[PDB]
């Protein structure tokens, strides 16, 4: 039960002038913060998004980011001018930052930077560095970003101390939302597929771990194709399992669904 905290940033630069930066923050599969370009301040999307920080501690932290966002926008603009005409607009930059919480007050922080949808740069130790696969021209940006000692000290304190502290508080304040149990509802349906395809729908369950198999009596069908986990708007999950069968063979088949919320009483739907 190791929760990963993710501060996702997306920045788009269309030309020299026009740009926008939007962020979202995840603790596991729950959104905690939102920061639209239009908004001057970071928005809580949960009651407990402030964690265990005081109002004074949060203001300090928010201000750090407010300066960051404006600063970052100008830096990228200047870095483009520096590399010009090697690299040109439009430019897409993504940041994935945060810390992965382990038991026994253990964690591991990270700050990954993608450029045009490719992971090129990370903050490691006490400096920025390129990763394997990165183009060599980024060495000048990296040299320049590593010149700024103030930024380095700040990010170090942010990744080493501030992240694990904050996230450890989040886990306490948002315990009831994190550990919530939402029950799945299931329903059946069928379509042709080159031979019909039976579909077992499972919707409205939390947390994400779930077990869904087609069965005839007590015989797990090997042809059961589990689909992707699709989200609902109310922060519950949707999954479907399909089984390809022949016409007149649908009789006998059932869809069994196991989930922690149901607590023993598995859902069994017969065709």
């Amino acid at each position, epitope marked *: 039960k190791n929760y990963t905290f993710r501060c996702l940033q997306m920045s788009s630069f269309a030309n020299r002038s026009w740009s926008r930066t939007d962020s979202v923050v995840w603790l596991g599969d729950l959104q905690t913060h939102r920061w639209s370009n239009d908004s001057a301040t970071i928005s809580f999307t949960k009651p407990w998004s402030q964690g265990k920080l005081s109002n004074q501690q949060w203001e300090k932290l928010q201000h750090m980011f407010q300066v960051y966002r*404006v600063s970052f926008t100008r830096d990228i603009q200047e870095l483009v001018k520096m590399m010009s005409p090697k690299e040109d607009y439009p430019i897409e930059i993504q940041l994935s930052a945060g810390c992965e919480m382990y038991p026994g007050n253990a964690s591991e922080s990270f700050l990954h930077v993608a450029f045009q949808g490719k992971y090129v740069v990370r903050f490691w130790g006490t400096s920025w560095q390129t990763v394997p696969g990165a183009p060599s021209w980024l060495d000048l940006p990296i040299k320049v970003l590593n*010149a700024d000692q*103030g930024t380095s000290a700040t990010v170090q304190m942010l990744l080493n101390d501030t992240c694990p502290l904050f996230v450890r508080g989040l886990l306490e304040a948002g315990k009831s939302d994190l550990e919530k149990q939402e029950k799945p509802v299931a329903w059946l349906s069928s379509v042709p597929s080159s031979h019909r395809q039976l579909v077992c729908h499972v919707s409205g369950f939390y947390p994400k771990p779930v077990w869904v198999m087609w069965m005839r009596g007590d015989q797990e069908q090997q042809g059961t194709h589990r689909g992707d986990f699709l989200p609902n708007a109310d922060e519950t999950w949707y999954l479907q399992a399909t089984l390809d069968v022949e016409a007149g063979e649908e009789a006998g088949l059932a869809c069994r669904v196991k989930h922690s919320s149901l607590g023993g009483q598995d859902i069994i739907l017969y065709w």
Partner: T-cell receptor
Amino acid sequence: TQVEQSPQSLVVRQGENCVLQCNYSVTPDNHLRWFKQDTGKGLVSLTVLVDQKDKTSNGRYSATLDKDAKHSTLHITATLLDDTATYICVVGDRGSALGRLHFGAGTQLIVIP
Amino acid sequence: EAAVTQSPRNKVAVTGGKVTLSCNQTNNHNNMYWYRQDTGHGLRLIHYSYGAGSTEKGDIPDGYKASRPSQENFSLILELATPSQTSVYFCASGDEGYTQYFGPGTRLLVLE
């Protein structure tokens, strides 16, 4: 202008001390540099302040910075005739070449010998 | 001692004339900068360059063209000089750090 200096000008007698003020609104504020400009000549760096509550010294020149207040002062102890100059306050908004320098208009010091 | 030189150091020009302020730097600095100094104002940026071939607009670029033919030389070109461009012009250079090393200045007077 994001960098204001005070006083605009002042006159002192040789041997006396003076305090020069710099107040800025630059955001962010990485470092602050004090220059000396003799009449006609170029810019001579006296000191550079980087920390949140920094103090520096350079012989007769000492300076302080408080980033919370966005305030810095240059102290000249025991003024000599050669101190007759303009004293310029510059704030840098980055710790790298990506930074823009924000210049004060200066403070004219005259030392009566 | 990263030194920077400017030429000319002092220049008298006529309105509508062409004036070229040069700046040489042997420190192998990628970055060079052009400022002018006027009373009531601090130094104001005109043009800067991040390397040979690059020129970028400052805060007050109007009436000036920049030129970075090499790593060493950065020129400020007044194509059609005007009295308003009477000033003291300072060139500077620097590496990836925040420090800019300033030249000794150029006094330009533009007469009618």
